[PDB]
Design a binder for these strands. Structure first.
Ligand SMILES: [Mg+2]
Ligand SMILES: [Mg+2]
Ligand SMILES: [Mg+2]
Ligand SMILES: [Zn+2]
Lengths: 135, 94, 136, 134, 38
RNA sequence: AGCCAGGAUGUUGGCUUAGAAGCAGCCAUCAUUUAAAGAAAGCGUAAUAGCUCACUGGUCGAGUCGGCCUGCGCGGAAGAU
């Protein structure tokens, strides 16, 4: 078993996380100090966004059982992906602000409505309001 | 669980045993029960590996000779005085 | 050092050292220093190896000495001609045959036992090996 | 940028620091008094983790933290040592309410923690130090 | 350097090298660790 | 294996000391955030800044580690016409 068991498990955790995940916004994660990500990670905690990085191969095995065949093209090199498990949306805006104001990666891709969102069309999810608007 | 392939020895004695051990084999004896003891030969390295696991000396072992299988237990072992090698093994029929 | 408290006879024939050893298994401890070569083990060498092991483990665990020097070795005084009787006992040795377990250890990790036995083996005139207790 | 000048309640900390800050052309006396005026409300025996920032413009930029948790012994435990040999002795016990009070006190510094996880975190320090709860 | 019958690594930075049919120990850290079999 | 990035919070753990901040010494060695990160493996320092290791992700793309038995070799190996 050992670490192969652990990696079999690692896929398992991201698998059922993707079951409850609603909208996914994938970005990169290189060249930035770890302490700087404390702001985004704390934001994800409080805004109900779960972030995790598995290998291109573990990312390959871990999305076939979930409705996430749309974002299969953008899996090249390092793949940071965060998942909004509650209050769907409001994740592209959370990453746009940190991307354009820090001179680094803009965006990789996204995932919503069972279709892939290109890099230049993430503004719809960035401008998408909260779920509580019918009142 | 531990199955050992064996062949019936055709020649016995001091000289034959040394020739066997030079050929990377070693003799063993199967006795017990109402039938006559059977002298067989084992290939050294495979048995040397199985005997490293302690369960070998506790579980019922299976020895296959001429297709026929006999359930035995390791009754006694003769090791080389200073080399990590086996010289002889006693098997009692289970 | 080790030597018999008393003996039936003061002096002993030279004899020979043929054959393999008796006591080839680890009987008391869990690790043992088995002798591969053949020769004599003097009381001084046995004590020298014992100290090296004992300090290596810092007197933790238990140590068994499976050999005892019981054969007296005589030497004539310096610059003395042949004959005029057998020489005087000078020291005691233990005859060692291949396969003899010389030292045993318990209560220490295996790796610590290996270095402890390695340090003692450098004090002995006979090639040795490290052996472990075997079930049956 | 090195943590120094703690125990702001005591002015001119030259004897503890001395030639350590002599590399930087910082007025030891002048800046110590100024920091005292800003933060004289705290207890005299309370360290404040501050840095000494140097850049091209020589513009000081400092932000204030909370006193270290260990000097936080006379508040409820009423001890000054804890244990010469920690976990081998017992000098006092901390109430559940006390560490929670420190928990929201230090919530502005924990880089990553939740209110509950911070409370469980600071109780680990107390156990390893020698204090107990419940 | 140390010329002795038994040459061996004395630290993690020592390296066993055979240069002219002789065994040598070269150390990037401790020049005291330089040995040669002889 | 090499190369890139990170190696964090409590926290300068407690005691000691003029100071002892992972790194003189003694005791403890937990807890969080973590992808990882020791109350620190070595250098550092008056005490700390500072370097680097464990540890973790990335790149690379197929083998790679350390024992066991054994054949032949190597060093150990300096004398006098
Ligand atoms: Mg013959
Ligand atoms: Mg040359
Ligand atoms: Mg030779
Ligand atoms: Zn070296």
């Amino acid at each position: 078993a050992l670490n192969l068991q652990d990696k079999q498990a690692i896929v398992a955790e991201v698998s059922e996380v993707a079951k409850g995940a609603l909208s996914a916004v994938v970005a990169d994660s290189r060249g930035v100090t770890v302490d700087k990500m404390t702001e985004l990670r704390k934001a994800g905690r409080e805004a109900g966004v779960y972030m995790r990085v598995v290998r291109n191969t573990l990312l390959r095995r871990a999305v076939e059982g979930t409705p996430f065949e749309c974002l299969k093209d953008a899996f090249v090199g390092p793949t940071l992906i965060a998942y909004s498990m509650e209050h769907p949306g409001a994740a592209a805006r959370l990453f746009k602000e940190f991307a354009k104001a820090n001179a680094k990666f803009e965006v990789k891709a996204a995932a919503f409505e069972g279709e892939l969102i290109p890099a230049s069309q993430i503004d719809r999810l960035a401008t998408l309001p909260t779920y509580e608007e019918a009142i | 669980m531990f199955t050992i392939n064996a062949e019936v020895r055709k020649e016995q004695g001091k000289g034959a045993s040394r020739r066997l051990r030079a050929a990377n084999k070693f003799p063993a004896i199967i006795y017990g029960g109402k039938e006559a003891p059977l002298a067989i030969e084992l290939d050294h390295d495979k048995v040397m590996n199985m005997q490293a696991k302690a369960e070998f000396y506790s579980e019922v072992l299976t020895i296959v000779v001429d297709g026929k299988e006999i359930k035995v237990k390791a009754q006694d072992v003769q090791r080389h005085p200073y080399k990590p090698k086996l010289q002889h093994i006693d098997f009692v029929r289970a | 050092m080790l030597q018999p408290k008393r003996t039936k006879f003061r002096k002993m024939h030279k004899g020979r050292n043929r054959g393999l050893a008796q006591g080839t298994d680890v009987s008391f401890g869990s690790f043992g220093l088995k002798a591969v070569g053949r020769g004599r083990l003097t009381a001084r060498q046995i004590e020298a190896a014992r100290r090296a092991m004992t300090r290596a483990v810092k007197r933790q665990g238990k140590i068994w000495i499976r050999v005892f020097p019981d054969k007296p070795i005589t030497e004539k005084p310096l610059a003395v001609r042949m004959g005029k009787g057998k020489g005087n006992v000078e020291y005691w040795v233990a005859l060692i045959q291949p396969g003899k377990v010389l030292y045993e250890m318990d209560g220490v990790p295996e790796e610590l036992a290996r270095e402890a036995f390695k340090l003692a083996a450098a004090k002995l005139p006979i090639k040795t090996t490290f052996v472990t207790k075997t079930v049956m | 940028y090195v943590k120094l000048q703690v125990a702001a309640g005591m002015a001119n900390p030259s004897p503890p620091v001395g030639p350590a800050l002599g590399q930087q052309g910082v007025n030891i006396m002048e800046f110590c008094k100024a920091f005292n005026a800003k933060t004289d409300s705290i207890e005299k025996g309370l360290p404040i983790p501050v840095v000494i920032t140097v850049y091209a413009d020589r513009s000081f930029t400092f932000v204030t933290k909370t006193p270290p948790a260990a000097v936080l012994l006379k508040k409820a435990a009423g001890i000054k040592s804890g244990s010469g040999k920690p976990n081998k002795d017992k000098v006092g016990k901390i109430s559940r309410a006390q560490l929670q009070e420190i928990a929201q006190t230090k919530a502005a510094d924990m880089t990553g923690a939740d209110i509950e996880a911070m409370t469980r975190s600071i109780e680990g320090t107390a156990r390893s130090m020698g204090l107990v709860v419940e | 350097m140390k010329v002795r019958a038994s040459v061996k690594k004395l630290c993690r930075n020592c390296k066993i090298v055979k240069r002219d049919g002789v065994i040598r120990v070269i150390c990037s850290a401790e020049p005291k660790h330089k040995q040669r079999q002889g």
